[PDB]
Design a protein around this nucleic acid. Structure first.
Ligand SMILES: [Zn+2]
Length: 632
RNA sequence: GCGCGCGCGC
RNA sequence: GCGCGCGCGC
């Protein structure tokens, strides 16, 4: 359960060796518990390995909050018995606390890295040598300009700067090292090297002496990809779609601020992109108007479901779902709006059924799926099969379809001890796994996995992924054969070259250009404000002042409010024209003042003296006379 | 908002 | 580079 006493498995003992022997290691092991337990061991040996009058300090880096939390607990619980001081710091703690002190008085610190990057940048923590051990969760992210790398740039600057200063052991954990954009083993192997260089790892630990034991707590099924296709012509999706347009235009006219309700533009019926757009519009409207909408949208949703049922199951099943829903409102409480929609449907109802019964509108997708089930079960009749589909709706359709089938009468299906096939949308020891048009992709011997998609891209993407997993396995298998001394030297060339381009590629101060400039909405090219009215908060954030602007923009209220540096996210802000409605940035309370904060990418820079129109995506890029903030 | 990573098109 | 998305962090 991850939260108690455990017997380490041989394979984890093996994985830890190189860490325990003191080398900087990358630990490539498959997903889950594995890594946690392993990083518990290392950590336990690290702080134990010390002689009296000496203490270790371990820091553990984690990318997501959920991970920062689940790992703060595990570490706390586990090292509780032992007497060590354990904490974490994340975005939500970090606000106003003596970060040097928290480290100073702690044996295990859990962090999200952007904290450390921030605190080394300030000088509040002068050096990494305070730490004895660094652990990088999901360490394959150590590249490019990621926090992990910023940390290492600091470390490698201390290491190669020829400066002492001791430095910590560095460990990274991963299920999968990556291969970047490599096209063959040669390049993959270059990629993994540069990766090791960045972590100053001299060893990559994987499981070798304990394969029989790993390959049984982590299948690893047989991967089968199987292309299909939808029907030749779907004249049913034409009917329901026309009904959706119809009911959308009916909601538009009762609402008219409709499109503005969400910036989820270019929506397409019968896509889950649409199902969200629905929800975002229903939560958004902040009420006789809002109650009219809930009803119209509650109808478009079932319509949307319906299409998704048609496309992956059969029309008979889409229709049924719809007859059901409509039945359920003819059965009270009934009002004009609802009786309207029910009528506009009742009108197609006859035609929908002709298209439904039409022999040439069966779903070729289902015959394939069928084949697969007859193929696999004739091999083994005691097979227990699991079926993943996209929507809770499609779950029933597929169940009904199977029950209502003479070609596969042999199944006993179930859903969300006697049953022998299970259908589902979310959540093992089953022996047959089928991802049917599942979108998707997320998550003892002889086991098979089938993906079935009409999409080529997916099938082709997934096959590229399999070729990379081999490319990756082989490379590792072979750099594992290099003698460490040789490997450490290859790494050092890399570290060196990489260090050099960091300093070289830096650039002097940028000479600021006094000339006043217009900011123009990037979309409609209407005037927004002037750079004269712009001010800079905390060196990083930009506001305008004065009311000439207080009405150049409109403010729909944010659906994701948060606080950062200081100050609260309250609203998104938008170009005030009715057909432009470009996204301008946001509007916050800061200290005492509600103020707008704007992103330059939402604008064109036109010099007034000349008319020249430059475009920036980052304020760091845009060099003008920036002025800090206060009374006004 | 800022920062970081990833994908799609051109 | 521009356009349009996703996920993540401060
Ligand atoms: Zn505009």
């Amino acid at each position: 359960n991850l939260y108690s006493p455990f017997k380490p498995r041989n394979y984890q003992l093996e994985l830890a060796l190189p860490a325990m022997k003191g080398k900087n290691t990358i630990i490539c092991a498959p997903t889950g518990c594995g890594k946690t337990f392993v990083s518990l061991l290392i950590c336990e040996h690290h702080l134990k390995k010390f002689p009296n009058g000496q203490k270790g300090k371990v820091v553990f880096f984690a990318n997501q909050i959920p991970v920062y939390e689940q790992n703060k607990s595990v570490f706390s619980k586990y090292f509780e018995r032992h007497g060590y001081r354990v904490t974490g710091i994340s975005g939500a703690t970090a606000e106003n606390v003596p970060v040097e002190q928290i480290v100073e008085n702690n044996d295990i610190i859990i962090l999200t890295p952007q904290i450390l990057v921030n605190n080394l940048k300030k000088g509040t923590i002068p050096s990494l040598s305070i730490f004895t051990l660094m652990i990088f969760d999901e360490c394959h992210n150590t590249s490019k300009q990621h926090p992990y790398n910023m940390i290492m740039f600091n470390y490698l600057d201390q290491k190669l700067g020829g400066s002492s200063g001791p430095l910590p052991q560095v460990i990274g954990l991963t299920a999968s090292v990556g291969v970047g954009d490599a096209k063959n083993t040669d390049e993959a192997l270059d990629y993994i090297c540069k990766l090791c260089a960045s972590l100053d790892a001299s060893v990559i630990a994987t499981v070798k002496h304990n394969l029989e034991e790993l390959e049984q707590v982590v299948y690893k099924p047989q991967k089968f990809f199987r292309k299909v296709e939808s029907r030749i012509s779907d004249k049913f999706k034409y009917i329901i779609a026309q009904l959706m347009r119809d009911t959308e235009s009916l909601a538009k006219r009762i609402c008219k601020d409709l499109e503005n309700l969400s910036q989820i533009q270019n929506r397409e019926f019968g896509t889950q992109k649409y199902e969200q757009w629905i929800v975002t519009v229903q939560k958004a409207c902040m009420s006789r108007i809002c109650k009219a909408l809930f009803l119209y949208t509650s109808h478009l949703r079932k319509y949307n479901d319906a299409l998704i049922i048609s496309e992956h199951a059969r029309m008979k099943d889409a229709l049924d779902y719809l007859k059901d829903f409509f039945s359920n409102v003819r059965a009270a409480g009934f009002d004009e709006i609802e009786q309207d929609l029910t009528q506009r449907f009742e009108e197609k109802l006859q035609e929908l059924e002709s298209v439904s019964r039409d022999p040439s509108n069966e779903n070729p997708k289902l015959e394939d799926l069928c084949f697969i089930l007859q193929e696999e079960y004739h091999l083994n009749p005691e097979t227990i099969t699991i079926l993943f589909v996209k929507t809770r709706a499609l779950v029933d359709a597929l169940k009904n379809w199977i029950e209502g089938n003479p070609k596969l009468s042999f199944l006993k299906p179930g859903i969300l001890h006697n049953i022998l096939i299970l259908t589902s949308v979310a959540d093992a020891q089953c022996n047959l796994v089928i991802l049917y048009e599942y979108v998707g992709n997320v998550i003892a011997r002889g086991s098979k996995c089938f993906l079935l998609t009409s999409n080529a891209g997916v099938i082709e993407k997934e096959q590229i992924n399999m070729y990379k997993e081999k490319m990756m396995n082989d490379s590792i298998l072979r750099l594992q054969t290099w003698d460490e001394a040789v490997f450490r030297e290859k790494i050092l060339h890399i570290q060196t070259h990489e260090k050099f381009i960091r300093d070289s590629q830096e650039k002097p101060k940028p000479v600021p250009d006094k000339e006043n400039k217009k900011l123009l909405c990037r979309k409609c090219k209407a005037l927004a404000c002037y750079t004269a009215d712009v001010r800079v908060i905390e060196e990083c954030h930009y506001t305008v002042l004065g009311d000439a602007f207080k009405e150049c923009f409109v403010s729909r209220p944010h659906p994701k409010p948060k606080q950062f540096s200081s100050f609260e996210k309250r609203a998104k802000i938008f170009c005030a024209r009715q057909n432009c409605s470009h996204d301008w940035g946001i509007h916050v309370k800061y200290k005492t003042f509600e103020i707008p904060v704007i992103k330059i990418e939402s604008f064109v820079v036109e010099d007034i003296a000349t008319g020249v129109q430059t475009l920036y995506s980052k304020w760091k890029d845009f060099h003008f006379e920036k002025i800090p903030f206060d009374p006004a």
